[PDB]
PDB file of N, CA and C in Angstrom:
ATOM      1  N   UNK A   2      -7.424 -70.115 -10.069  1.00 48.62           N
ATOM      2  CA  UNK A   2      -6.593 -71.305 -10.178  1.00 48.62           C
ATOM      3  C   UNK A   2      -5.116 -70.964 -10.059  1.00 48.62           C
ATOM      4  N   UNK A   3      -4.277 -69.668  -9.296  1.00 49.58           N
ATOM      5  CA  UNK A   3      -3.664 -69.377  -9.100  1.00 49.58           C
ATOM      6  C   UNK A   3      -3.126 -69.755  -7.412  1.00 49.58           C
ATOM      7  N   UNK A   4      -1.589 -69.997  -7.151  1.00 52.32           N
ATOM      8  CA  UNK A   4      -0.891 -70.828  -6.317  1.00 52.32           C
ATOM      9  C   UNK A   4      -0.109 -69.788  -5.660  1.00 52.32           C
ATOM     10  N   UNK A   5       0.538 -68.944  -6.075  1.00 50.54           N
ATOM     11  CA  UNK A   5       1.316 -67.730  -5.672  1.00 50.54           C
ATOM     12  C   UNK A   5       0.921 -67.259  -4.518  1.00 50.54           C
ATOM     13  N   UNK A   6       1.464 -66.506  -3.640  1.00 48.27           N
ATOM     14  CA  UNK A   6       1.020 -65.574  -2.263  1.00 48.27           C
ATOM     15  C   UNK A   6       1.545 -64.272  -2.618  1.00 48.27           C
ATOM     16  N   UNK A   7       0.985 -63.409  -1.806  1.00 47.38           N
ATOM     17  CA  UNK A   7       1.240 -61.996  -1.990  1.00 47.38           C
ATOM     18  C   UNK A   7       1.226 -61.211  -1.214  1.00 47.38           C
ATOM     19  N   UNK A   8       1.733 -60.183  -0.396  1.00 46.53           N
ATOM     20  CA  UNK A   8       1.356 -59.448   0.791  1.00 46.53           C
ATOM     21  C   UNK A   8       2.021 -57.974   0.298  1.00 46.53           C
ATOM     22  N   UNK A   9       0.997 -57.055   0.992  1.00 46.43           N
ATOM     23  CA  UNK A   9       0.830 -55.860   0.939  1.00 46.43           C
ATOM     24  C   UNK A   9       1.369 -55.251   1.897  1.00 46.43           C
ATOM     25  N   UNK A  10       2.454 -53.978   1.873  1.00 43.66           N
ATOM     26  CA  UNK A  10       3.096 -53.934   3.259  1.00 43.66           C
ATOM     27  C   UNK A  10       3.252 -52.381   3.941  1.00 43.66           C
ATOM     28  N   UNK A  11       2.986 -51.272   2.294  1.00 42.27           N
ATOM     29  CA  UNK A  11       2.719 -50.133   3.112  1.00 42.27           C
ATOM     30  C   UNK A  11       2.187 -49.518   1.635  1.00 42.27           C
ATOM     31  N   UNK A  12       1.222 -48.687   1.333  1.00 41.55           N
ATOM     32  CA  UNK A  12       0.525 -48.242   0.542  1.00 41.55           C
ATOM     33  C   UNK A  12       0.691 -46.757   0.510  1.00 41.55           C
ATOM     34  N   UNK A  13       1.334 -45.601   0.216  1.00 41.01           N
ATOM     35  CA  UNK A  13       1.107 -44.240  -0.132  1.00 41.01           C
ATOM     36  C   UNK A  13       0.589 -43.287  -0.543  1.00 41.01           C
ATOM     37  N   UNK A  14       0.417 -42.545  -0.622  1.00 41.59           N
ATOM     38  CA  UNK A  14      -0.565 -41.492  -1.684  1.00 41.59           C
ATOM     39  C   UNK A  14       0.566 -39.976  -2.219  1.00 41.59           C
ATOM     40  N   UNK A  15       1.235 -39.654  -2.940  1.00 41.51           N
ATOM     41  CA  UNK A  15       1.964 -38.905  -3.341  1.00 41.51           C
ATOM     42  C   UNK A  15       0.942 -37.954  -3.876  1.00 41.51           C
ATOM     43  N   UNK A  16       1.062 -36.626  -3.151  1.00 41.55           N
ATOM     44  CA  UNK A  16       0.542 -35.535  -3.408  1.00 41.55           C
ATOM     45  C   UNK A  16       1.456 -34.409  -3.489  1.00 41.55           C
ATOM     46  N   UNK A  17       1.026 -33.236  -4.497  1.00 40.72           N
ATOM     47  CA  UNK A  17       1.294 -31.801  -4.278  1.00 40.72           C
ATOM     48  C   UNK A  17       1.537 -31.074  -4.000  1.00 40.72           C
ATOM     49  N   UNK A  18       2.730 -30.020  -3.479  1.00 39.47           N
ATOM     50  CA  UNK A  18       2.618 -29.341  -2.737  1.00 39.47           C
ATOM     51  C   UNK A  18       1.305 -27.989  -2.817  1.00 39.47           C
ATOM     52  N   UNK A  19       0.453 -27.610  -1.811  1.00 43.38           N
ATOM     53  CA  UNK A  19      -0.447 -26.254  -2.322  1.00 43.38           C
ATOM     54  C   UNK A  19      -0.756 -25.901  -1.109  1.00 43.38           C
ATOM     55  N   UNK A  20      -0.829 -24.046  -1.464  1.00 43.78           N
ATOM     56  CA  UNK A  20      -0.888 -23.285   0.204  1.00 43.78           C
ATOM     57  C   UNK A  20      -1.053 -22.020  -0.582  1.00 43.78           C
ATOM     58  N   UNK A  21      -2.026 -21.538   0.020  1.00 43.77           N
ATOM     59  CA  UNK A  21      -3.071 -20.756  -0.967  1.00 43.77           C
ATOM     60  C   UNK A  21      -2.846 -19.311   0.578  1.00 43.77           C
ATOM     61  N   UNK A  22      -1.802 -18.910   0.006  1.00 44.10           N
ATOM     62  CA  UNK A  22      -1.286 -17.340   0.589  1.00 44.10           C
ATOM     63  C   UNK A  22      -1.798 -16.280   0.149  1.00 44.10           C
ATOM     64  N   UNK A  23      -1.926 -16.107  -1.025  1.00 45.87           N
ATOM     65  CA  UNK A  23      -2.054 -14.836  -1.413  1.00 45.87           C
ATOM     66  C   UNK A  23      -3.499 -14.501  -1.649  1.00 45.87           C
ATOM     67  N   UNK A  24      -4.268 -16.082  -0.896  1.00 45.58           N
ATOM     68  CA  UNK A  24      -5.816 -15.428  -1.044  1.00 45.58           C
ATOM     69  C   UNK A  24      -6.296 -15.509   0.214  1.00 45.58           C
ATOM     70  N   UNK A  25      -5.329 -16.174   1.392  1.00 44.82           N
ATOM     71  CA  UNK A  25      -5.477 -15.369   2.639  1.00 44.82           C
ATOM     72  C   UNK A  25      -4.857 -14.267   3.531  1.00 44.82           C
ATOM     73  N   UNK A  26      -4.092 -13.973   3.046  1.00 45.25           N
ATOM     74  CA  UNK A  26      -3.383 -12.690   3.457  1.00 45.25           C
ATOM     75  C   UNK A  26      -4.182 -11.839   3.141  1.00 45.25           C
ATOM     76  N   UNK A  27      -4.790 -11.593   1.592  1.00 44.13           N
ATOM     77  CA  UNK A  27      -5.444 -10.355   1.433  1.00 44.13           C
ATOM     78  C   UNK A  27      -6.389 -10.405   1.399  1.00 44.13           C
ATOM     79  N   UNK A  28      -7.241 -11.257   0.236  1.00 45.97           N
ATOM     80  CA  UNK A  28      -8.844 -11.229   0.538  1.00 45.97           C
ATOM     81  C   UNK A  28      -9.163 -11.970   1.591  1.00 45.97           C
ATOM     82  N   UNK A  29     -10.067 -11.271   2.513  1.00 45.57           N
ATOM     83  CA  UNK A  29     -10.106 -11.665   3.854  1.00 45.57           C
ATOM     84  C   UNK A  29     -12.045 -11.863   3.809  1.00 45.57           C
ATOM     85  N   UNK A  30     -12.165 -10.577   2.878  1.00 42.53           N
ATOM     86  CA  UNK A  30     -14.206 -10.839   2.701  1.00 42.53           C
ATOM     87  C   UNK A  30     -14.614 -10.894   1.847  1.00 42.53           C
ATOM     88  N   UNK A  31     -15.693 -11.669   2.203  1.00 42.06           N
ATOM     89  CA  UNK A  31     -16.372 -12.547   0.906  1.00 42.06           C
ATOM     90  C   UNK A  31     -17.817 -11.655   1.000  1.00 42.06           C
ATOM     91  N   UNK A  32     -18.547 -11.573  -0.345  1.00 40.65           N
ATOM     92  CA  UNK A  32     -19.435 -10.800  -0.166  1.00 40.65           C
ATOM     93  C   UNK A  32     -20.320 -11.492  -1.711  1.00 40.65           C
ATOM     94  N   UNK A  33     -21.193 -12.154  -1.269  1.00 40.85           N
ATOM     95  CA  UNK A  33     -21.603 -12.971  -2.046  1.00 40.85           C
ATOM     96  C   UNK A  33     -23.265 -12.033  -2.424  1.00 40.85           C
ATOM     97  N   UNK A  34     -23.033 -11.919  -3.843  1.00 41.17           N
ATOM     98  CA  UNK A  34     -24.526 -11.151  -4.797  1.00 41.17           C
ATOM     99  C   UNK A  34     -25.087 -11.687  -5.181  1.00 41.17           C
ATOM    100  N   UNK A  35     -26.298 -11.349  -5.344  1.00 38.55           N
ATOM    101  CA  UNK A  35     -27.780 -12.082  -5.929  1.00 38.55           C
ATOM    102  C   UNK A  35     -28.278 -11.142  -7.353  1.00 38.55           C
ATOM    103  N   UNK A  36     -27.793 -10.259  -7.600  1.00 37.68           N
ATOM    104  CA  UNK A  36     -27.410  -9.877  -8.662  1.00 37.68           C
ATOM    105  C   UNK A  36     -26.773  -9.815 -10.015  1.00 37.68           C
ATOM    106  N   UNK A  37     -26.735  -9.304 -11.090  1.00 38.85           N
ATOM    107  CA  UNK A  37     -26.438  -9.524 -12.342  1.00 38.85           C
ATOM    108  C   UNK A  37     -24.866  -9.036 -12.604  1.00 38.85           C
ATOM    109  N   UNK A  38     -24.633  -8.250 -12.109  1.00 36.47           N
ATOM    110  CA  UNK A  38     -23.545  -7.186 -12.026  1.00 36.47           C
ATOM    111  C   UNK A  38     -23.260  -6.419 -10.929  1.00 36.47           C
ATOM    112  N   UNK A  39     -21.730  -6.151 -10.316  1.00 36.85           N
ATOM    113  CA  UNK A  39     -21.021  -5.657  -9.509  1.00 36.85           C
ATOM    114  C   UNK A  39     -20.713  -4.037 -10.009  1.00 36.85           C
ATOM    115  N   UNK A  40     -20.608  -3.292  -9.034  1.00 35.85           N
ATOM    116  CA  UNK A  40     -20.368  -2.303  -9.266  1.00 35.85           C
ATOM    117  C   UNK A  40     -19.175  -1.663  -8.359  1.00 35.85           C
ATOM    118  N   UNK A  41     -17.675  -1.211  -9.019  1.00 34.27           N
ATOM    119  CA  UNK A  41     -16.853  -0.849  -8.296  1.00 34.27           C
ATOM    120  C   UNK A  41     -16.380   0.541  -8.397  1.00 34.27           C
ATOM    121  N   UNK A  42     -15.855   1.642  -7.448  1.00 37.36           N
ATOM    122  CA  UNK A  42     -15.941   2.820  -8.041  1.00 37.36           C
ATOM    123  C   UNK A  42     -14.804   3.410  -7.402  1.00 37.36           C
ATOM    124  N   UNK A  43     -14.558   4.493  -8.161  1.00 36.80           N
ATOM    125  CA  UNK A  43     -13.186   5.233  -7.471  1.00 36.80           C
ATOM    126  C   UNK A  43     -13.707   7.143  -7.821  1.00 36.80           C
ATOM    127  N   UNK A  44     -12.656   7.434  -7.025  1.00 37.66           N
ATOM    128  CA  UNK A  44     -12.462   9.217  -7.122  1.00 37.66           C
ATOM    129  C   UNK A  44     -11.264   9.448  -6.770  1.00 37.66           C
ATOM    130  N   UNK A  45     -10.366  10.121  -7.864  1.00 34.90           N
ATOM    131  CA  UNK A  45      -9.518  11.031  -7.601  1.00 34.90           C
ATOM    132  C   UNK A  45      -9.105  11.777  -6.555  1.00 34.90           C
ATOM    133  N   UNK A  46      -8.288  12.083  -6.147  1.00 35.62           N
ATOM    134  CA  UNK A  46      -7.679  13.002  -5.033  1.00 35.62           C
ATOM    135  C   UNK A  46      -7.131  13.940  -4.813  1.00 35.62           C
ATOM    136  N   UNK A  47      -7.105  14.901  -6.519  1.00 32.49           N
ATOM    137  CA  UNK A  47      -5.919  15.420  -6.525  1.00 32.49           C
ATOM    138  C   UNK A  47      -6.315  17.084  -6.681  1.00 32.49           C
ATOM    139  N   UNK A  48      -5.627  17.853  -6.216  1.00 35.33           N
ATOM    140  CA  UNK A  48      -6.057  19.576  -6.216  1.00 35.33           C
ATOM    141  C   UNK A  48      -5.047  20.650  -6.645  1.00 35.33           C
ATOM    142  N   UNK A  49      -4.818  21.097  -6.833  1.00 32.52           N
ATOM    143  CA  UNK A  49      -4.325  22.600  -7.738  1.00 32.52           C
ATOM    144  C   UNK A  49      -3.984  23.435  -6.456  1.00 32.52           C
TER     145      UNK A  49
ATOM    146  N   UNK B 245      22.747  10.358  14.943  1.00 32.13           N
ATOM    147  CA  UNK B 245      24.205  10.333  13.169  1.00 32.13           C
ATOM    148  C   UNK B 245      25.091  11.106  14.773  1.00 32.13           C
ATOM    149  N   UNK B 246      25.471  10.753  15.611  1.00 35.10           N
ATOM    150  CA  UNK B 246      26.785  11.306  16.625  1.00 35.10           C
ATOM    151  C   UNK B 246      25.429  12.012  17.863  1.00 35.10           C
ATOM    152  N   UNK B 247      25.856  13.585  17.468  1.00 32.57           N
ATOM    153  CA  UNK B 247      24.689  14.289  18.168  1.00 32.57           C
ATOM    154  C   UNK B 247      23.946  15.075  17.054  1.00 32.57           C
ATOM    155  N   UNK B 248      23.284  14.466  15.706  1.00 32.03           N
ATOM    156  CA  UNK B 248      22.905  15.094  14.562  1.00 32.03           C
ATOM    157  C   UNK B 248      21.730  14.248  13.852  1.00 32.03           C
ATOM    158  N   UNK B 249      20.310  14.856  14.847  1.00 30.66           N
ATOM    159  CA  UNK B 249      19.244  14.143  13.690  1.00 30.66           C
ATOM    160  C   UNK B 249      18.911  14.212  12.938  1.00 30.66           C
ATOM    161  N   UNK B 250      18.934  13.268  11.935  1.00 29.95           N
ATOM    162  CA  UNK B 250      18.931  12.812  11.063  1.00 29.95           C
ATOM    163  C   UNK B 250      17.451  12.786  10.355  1.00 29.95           C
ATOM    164  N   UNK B 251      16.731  13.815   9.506  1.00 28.54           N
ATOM    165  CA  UNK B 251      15.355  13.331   9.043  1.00 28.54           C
ATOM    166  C   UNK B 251      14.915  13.191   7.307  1.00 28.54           C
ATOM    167  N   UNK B 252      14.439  12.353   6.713  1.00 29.59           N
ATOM    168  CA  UNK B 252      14.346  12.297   5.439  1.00 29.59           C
ATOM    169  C   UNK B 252      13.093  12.842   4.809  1.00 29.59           C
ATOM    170  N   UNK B 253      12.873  13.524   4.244  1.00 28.78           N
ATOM    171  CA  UNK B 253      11.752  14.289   3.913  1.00 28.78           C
ATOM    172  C   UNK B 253      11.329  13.970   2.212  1.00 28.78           C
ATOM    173  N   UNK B 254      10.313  13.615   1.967  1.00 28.89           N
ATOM    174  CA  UNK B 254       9.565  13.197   0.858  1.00 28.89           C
ATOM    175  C   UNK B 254       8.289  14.049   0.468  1.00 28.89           C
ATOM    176  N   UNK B 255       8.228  14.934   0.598  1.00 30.50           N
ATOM    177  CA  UNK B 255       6.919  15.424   0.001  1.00 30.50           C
ATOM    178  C   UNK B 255       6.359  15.604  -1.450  1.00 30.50           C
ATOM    179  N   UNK B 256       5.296  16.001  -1.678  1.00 34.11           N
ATOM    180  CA  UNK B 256       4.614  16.005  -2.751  1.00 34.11           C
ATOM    181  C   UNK B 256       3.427  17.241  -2.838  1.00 34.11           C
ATOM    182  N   UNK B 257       3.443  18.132  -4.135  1.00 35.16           N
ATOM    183  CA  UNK B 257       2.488  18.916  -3.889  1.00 35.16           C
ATOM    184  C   UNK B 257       1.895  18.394  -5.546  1.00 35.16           C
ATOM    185  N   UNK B 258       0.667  18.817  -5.676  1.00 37.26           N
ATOM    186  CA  UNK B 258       0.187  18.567  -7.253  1.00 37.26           C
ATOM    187  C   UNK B 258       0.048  20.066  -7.662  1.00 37.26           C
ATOM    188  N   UNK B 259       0.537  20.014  -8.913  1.00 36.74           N
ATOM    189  CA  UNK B 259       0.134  21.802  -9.089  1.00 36.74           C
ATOM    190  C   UNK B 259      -0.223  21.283 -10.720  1.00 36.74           C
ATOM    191  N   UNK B 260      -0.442  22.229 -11.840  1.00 38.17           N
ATOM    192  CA  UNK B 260      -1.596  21.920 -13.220  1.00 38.17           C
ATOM    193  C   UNK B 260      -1.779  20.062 -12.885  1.00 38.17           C
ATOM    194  N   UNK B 261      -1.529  19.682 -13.932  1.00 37.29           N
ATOM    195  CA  UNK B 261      -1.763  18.049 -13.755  1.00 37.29           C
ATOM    196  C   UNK B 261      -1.252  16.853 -13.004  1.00 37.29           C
ATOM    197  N   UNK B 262       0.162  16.853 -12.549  1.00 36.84           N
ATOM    198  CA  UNK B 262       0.952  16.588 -12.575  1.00 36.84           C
ATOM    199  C   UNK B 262       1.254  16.706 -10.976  1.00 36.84           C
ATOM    200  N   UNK B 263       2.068  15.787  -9.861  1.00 36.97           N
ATOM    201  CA  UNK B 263       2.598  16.120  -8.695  1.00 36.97           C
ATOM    202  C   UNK B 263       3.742  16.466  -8.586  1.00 36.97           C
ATOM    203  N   UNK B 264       4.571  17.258  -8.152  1.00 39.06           N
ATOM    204  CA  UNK B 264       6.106  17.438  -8.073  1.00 39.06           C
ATOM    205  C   UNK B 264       6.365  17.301  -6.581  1.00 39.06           C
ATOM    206  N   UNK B 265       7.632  17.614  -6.204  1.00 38.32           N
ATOM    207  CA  UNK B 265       8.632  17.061  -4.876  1.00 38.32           C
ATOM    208  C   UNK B 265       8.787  19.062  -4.827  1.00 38.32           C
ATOM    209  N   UNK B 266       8.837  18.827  -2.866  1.00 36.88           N
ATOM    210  CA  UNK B 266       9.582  19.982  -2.461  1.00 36.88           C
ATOM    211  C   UNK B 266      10.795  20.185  -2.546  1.00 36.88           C
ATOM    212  N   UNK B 267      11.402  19.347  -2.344  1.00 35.59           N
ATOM    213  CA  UNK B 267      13.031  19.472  -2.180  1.00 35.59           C
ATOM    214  C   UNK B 267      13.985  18.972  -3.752  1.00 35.59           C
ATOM    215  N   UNK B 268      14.667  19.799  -3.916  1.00 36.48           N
ATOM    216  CA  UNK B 268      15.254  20.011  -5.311  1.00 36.48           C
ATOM    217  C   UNK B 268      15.692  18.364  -5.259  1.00 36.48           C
ATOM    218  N   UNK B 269      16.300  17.561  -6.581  1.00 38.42           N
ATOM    219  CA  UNK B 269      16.825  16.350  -6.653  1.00 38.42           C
ATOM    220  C   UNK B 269      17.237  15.919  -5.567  1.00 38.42           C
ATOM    221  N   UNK B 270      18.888  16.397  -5.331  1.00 39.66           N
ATOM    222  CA  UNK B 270      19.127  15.782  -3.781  1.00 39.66           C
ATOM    223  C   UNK B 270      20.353  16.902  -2.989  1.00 39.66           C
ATOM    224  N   UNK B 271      19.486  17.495  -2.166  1.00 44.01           N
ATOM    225  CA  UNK B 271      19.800  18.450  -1.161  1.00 44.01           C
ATOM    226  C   UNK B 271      20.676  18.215  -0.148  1.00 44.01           C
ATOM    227  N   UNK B 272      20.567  18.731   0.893  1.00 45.09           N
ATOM    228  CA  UNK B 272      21.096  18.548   2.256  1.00 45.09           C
ATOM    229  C   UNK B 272      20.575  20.105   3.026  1.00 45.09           C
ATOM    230  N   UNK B 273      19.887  19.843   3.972  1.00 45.63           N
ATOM    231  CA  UNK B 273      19.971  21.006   4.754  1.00 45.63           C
ATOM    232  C   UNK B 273      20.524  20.934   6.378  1.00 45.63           C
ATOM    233  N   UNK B 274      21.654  21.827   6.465  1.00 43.99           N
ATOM    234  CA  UNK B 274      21.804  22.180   8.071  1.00 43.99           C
ATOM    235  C   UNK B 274      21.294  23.260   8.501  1.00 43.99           C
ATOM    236  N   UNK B 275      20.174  22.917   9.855  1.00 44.97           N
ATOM    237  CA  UNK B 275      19.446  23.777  10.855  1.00 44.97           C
ATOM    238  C   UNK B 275      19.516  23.460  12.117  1.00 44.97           C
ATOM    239  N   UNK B 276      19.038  24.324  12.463  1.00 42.68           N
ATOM    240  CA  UNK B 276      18.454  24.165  14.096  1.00 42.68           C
ATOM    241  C   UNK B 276      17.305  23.888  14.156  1.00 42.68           C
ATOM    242  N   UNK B 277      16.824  22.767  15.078  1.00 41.79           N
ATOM    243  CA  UNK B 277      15.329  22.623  15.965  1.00 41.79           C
ATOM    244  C   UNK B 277      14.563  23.351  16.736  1.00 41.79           C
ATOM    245  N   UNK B 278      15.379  23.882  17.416  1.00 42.49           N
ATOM    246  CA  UNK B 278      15.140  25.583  17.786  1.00 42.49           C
ATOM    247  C   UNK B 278      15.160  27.353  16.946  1.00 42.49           C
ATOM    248  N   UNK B 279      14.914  26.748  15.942  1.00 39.31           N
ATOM    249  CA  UNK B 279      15.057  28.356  14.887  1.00 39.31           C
ATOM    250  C   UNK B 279      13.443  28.575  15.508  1.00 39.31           C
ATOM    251  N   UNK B 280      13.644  30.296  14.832  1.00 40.31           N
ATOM    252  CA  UNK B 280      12.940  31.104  14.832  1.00 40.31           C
ATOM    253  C   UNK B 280      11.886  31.048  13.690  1.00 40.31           C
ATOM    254  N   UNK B 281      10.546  30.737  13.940  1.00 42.42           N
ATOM    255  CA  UNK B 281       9.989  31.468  12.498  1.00 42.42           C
ATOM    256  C   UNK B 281       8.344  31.841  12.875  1.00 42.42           C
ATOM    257  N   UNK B 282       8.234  32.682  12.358  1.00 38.62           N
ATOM    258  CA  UNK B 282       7.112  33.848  12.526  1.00 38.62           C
ATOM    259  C   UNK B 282       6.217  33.273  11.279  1.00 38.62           C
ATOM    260  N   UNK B 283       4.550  32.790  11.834  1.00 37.46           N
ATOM    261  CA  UNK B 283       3.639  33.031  10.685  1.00 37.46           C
ATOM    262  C   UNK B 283       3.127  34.247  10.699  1.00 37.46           C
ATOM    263  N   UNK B 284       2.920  34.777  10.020  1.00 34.21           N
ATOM    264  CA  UNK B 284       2.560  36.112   9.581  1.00 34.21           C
ATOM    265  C   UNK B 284       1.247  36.322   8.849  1.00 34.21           C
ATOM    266  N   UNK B 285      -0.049  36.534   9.203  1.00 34.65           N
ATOM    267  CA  UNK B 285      -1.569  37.198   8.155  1.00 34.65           C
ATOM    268  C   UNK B 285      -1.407  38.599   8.019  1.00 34.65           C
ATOM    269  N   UNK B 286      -1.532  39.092   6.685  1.00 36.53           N
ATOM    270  CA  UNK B 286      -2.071  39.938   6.721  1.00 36.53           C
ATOM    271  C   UNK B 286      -3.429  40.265   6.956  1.00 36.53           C
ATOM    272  N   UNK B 287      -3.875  41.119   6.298  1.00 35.24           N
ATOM    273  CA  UNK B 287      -5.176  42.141   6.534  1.00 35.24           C
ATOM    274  C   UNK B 287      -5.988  41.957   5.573  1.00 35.24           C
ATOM    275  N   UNK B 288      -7.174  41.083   5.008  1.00 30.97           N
ATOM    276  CA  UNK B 288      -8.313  40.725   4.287  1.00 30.97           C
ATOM    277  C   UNK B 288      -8.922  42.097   3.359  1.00 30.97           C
ATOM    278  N   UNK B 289      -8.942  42.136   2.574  1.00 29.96           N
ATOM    279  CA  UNK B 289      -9.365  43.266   1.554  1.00 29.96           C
ATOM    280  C   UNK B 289     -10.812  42.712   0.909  1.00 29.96           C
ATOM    281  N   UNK B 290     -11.778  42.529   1.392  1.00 32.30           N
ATOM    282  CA  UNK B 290     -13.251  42.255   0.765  1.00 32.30           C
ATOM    283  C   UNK B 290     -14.187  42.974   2.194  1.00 32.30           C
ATOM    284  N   UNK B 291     -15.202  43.928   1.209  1.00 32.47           N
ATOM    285  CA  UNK B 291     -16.647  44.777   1.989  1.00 32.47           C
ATOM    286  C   UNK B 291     -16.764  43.738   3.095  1.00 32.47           C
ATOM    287  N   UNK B 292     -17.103  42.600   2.892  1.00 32.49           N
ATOM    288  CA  UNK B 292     -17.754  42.030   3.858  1.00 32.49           C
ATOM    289  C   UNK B 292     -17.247  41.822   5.205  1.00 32.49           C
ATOM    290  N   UNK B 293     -16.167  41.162   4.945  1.00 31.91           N
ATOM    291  CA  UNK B 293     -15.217  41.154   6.504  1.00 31.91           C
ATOM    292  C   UNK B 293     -14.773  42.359   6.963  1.00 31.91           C
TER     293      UNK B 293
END
């Protein structure tokens, strides 16, 4: 029971800036396990 | 550097635990590219060889 008019004339969406660098620059492979636990390992280099 | 190359040298040796540098804090050496130097073996002291 309203008389008024109304018009709609441009609608926006204001977003975020995001840019996800530092997980494509370096991690480059994905290596997906079916396993419980990862195993990562190293050795020394060094000699006398 | 005029007619004088110029090279920066960084090395590293590890000796007991620890790595140290060849070249004392901060040096300077003038040479020639053309020097002389002789490797030299001696003579093996073990029966077998």
């Amino acid at each position: 029971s309203m008389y008024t008019t109304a018009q709609l004339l441009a609608a926006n969406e204001q977003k975020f800036k995001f840019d996800p660098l530092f997980l494509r620059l370096f991690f480059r492979e994905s290596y997906p396990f079916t396993t419980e636990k990862v195993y990562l390992s190293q050795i020394p280099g060094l000699v006398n | 550097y005029g007619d004088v190359a110029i090279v920066v040298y960084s090395g590293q040796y590890v000796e007991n635990g620890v790595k140290k540098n060849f070249l004392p804090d901060n040096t300077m050496v003038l040479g020639n590219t053309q020097a002389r130097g002789l490797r030299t073996y001696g003579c093996i002291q073990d029966a077998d060889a």
